[PDB]
Design a protein around this ligand. Structure first.
Ligand SMILES: NC(=[NH2+])c1ccc2[nH]c(-c3ccccc3O)nc2c1
Ligand SMILES: [Ca+2]
Length: 223
């Protein structure tokens, strides 16, 4: 996260870190046995880390659980990143409490102007790599479809939305992929891609979760 602030330990209880010997992506806890992240974060050997704040120190509240299965959306396209969503079932259920809690799925899509909270342990520099130890937060508004499509002509599908600042300086960045974009207490987006990080006129692009709620529900129901 570039231009963001330190969230404060466990203030984002649904945030998870996907770890394979190092933190590589973020994710969101939606129930005690399922996490939602981005299909481009897929790999085998994933350990899900819940209740985390400093990812390099065990400080208490952490729950490390291995992934039992990862379900990438069947229509995920790695060249366009369309349908960039994945579900991870945990080997055992997490113990939910005030530090580890699930986030609700939306009932409607959000409108441009809606303010959302984006969080993650990704890069905090737009030029160079500086990964933080603790969770960073950023408040960003959803942008109108015309500004999004004017910024990335031909690259935005109806399963994507832009959020951020066209003047530059604040954005999600590498290491944040798969994490949450929460607006009014509902999971509306998943960190998916962007051109560089925090560059002027190049906002972040996110998976539009409201288009997948029925798939998420049907898939969890059958697995
Ligand atoms: N500017 C952004 N809003 C952004 C967000 C997530 C990203 N994730 C990545 C990324 C880069 C290399 C490998 C995996 C990634 O998810 N770049 C990213 C850029
Ligand atoms: Ca820790």
């Amino acid at each position: 996260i570039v231009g963001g602030y330190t969230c404060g330990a466990n203030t984002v209880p649904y945030q998870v870190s996907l770890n394979s010997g190092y933190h590589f992506c973020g994710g969101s806890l939606i129930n005690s046995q399922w996490v939602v992240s981005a299909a481009h974060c897929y790999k085998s050997g994933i350990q899900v880390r819940l209740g985390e704040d400093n990812i390099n120190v065990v400080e208490g509240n952490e729950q490390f659980i291995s992934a039992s299965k990862s379900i990438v959306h069947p229509s995920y396209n790695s060249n366009t990143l369309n349908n960039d969503i994945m579900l991870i079932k945990l080997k055992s259920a997490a113990s939910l409490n005030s530090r580890v809690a699930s986030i609700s799925l939306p009932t409607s899509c959000a409108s441009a102007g809606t303010q959302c909270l984006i969080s993650g342990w990704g890069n905090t520099k737009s030029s160079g790599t500086s990964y933080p130890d603790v969770l960073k937060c950023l408040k960003a508004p959803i942008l109108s479809d015309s500004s999004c499509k004017s910024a990335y002509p031909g690259q935005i599908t109806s399963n994507m939305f832009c959020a951020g600042y066209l003047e530059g300086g604040k954005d999600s960045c590498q290491g944040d992929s798969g994490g949450p974009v929460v607006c009014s207490g509902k999971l509306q987006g998943i960190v998916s891609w962007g051109s560089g990080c925090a560059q002027k006129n190049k906002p972040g692009v996110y998976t539009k979760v409201c288009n997948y709620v029925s798939w998420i529900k049907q898939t969890i129901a059958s697995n």
